[PDB]
């Protein structure tokens, strides 16, 4: 007789193994192998045909529904595993009435399989160049074998984009044009000088168990796949995408798709972790912009900056030499030293309220020169589960004007500690949880936590004697409030791209070219921008409930342990855990 607990564990395992077998590049990203997946995936490719996507989603939805129906005969953790794992399997199944798009192991259902910012043709090369080990002849051969399957990757991607277009689901012209530009850029240089080759050359050079001739032969093999398989595959998709441009819509938001409003309401649930209407979320955005702006005005006035909007004033500050690193090797070294100093200081000073140290140490890297033009200002990538590849805070050193000194502390807290690295690494350390719970990509939790972290860094005194850094923190908070306004603007209120750009520029003092990339991101990722503030507001609301309940018995360190040590979760589960803690005090 299989107990309910045993049936549930099998289901959670089945979810893990099935998702990752079909998302073998995500498996590589996390450093998973046959021990984790139940089969070797190290040279497997991902495929995206209509039938692939249908079967993947149907399996996960079946698992979700079976998990949800089981009667436990159990502690809060066992109950929470059921609820979280039913939710996560539904998140990766996607909205069951939409067969469009593709399932992303981070974002869940994602609407445009080919787009300008992510999707398999952007992310699979990134994983292969960054996360896939090349330390042995066998690992080199896995890289070659993967490259050789790019023809099928491309044909299945086109088949899915075509299926979606047959149902009148396709990207806006802007989104499609941005995808084309990427795809053209990918094959614009010679194959022999492609990053797939150059990365391979740099890694294979380090391998002492291969003779120089053996290394040369493998490099030739890589060049052959890139030239013969990769290049025509990308060209194929570029041409297909070009064919779709005339049908692509001029409208910017997801409302313009068939059933787009229903899609967006689902995105709000999955990525904002909210059941509020787009109207209510928009208004919360407007109120937060007013509130944060008003705070920043006061600080500005006190520094003698009394003319113009908050945004104008922040633009003016970004021009002053005291806020700009030199555009030189030494200036970039200064920036990197400053970052490293910020991490060291906060990690030490934060210990009284972050009393559990995760088993992974973060590292800082600059985006390579080849990718920095399209890359974000900063990003965090998770460690491999085993620690063999570190968590990394990536920083974009392309333009010093884009790295004003007053914005670096908040970015650094957000990406590293007490933000993404601290949270993600702690979640990975919860080895008693079902595996998908250890990497659960709850956007509102994950982004809301990191934005909350930025405020906690202030409450720990990281901006002592630093009013301009504090303004940088508040500017970053303001930016995320603007996100509530512009994402709901575009996708429900039918704001155009240009109206959203103008609003965001005017409200935040951010440079137009950065704003253009953000608004186009929001257009490709409806709802994703909502997680940051909705999650932060909920964490803070919970904290305020706890402080009211406990009074002078409130301990922020305990609150942090309840929020972090139970992993990334839906807000409803985070509230249940806070309440369990309050009830037992």
Automatic annotation (TrEMBL):
<keyword id="KW-0732">Signal</keyword>
<dbReference type="InterPro" id="IPR010281">
    <property type="entry name" value="DUF885"/>
</dbReference>
<dbReference type="Pfam" id="PF05960">
    <property type="entry name" value="DUF885"/>
</dbReference>
<keyword id="KW-0449">Lipoprotein</keyword>
<protein>
    <submittedName>
        <fullName>Putative lipoprotein</fullName>
    </submittedName>
</protein>
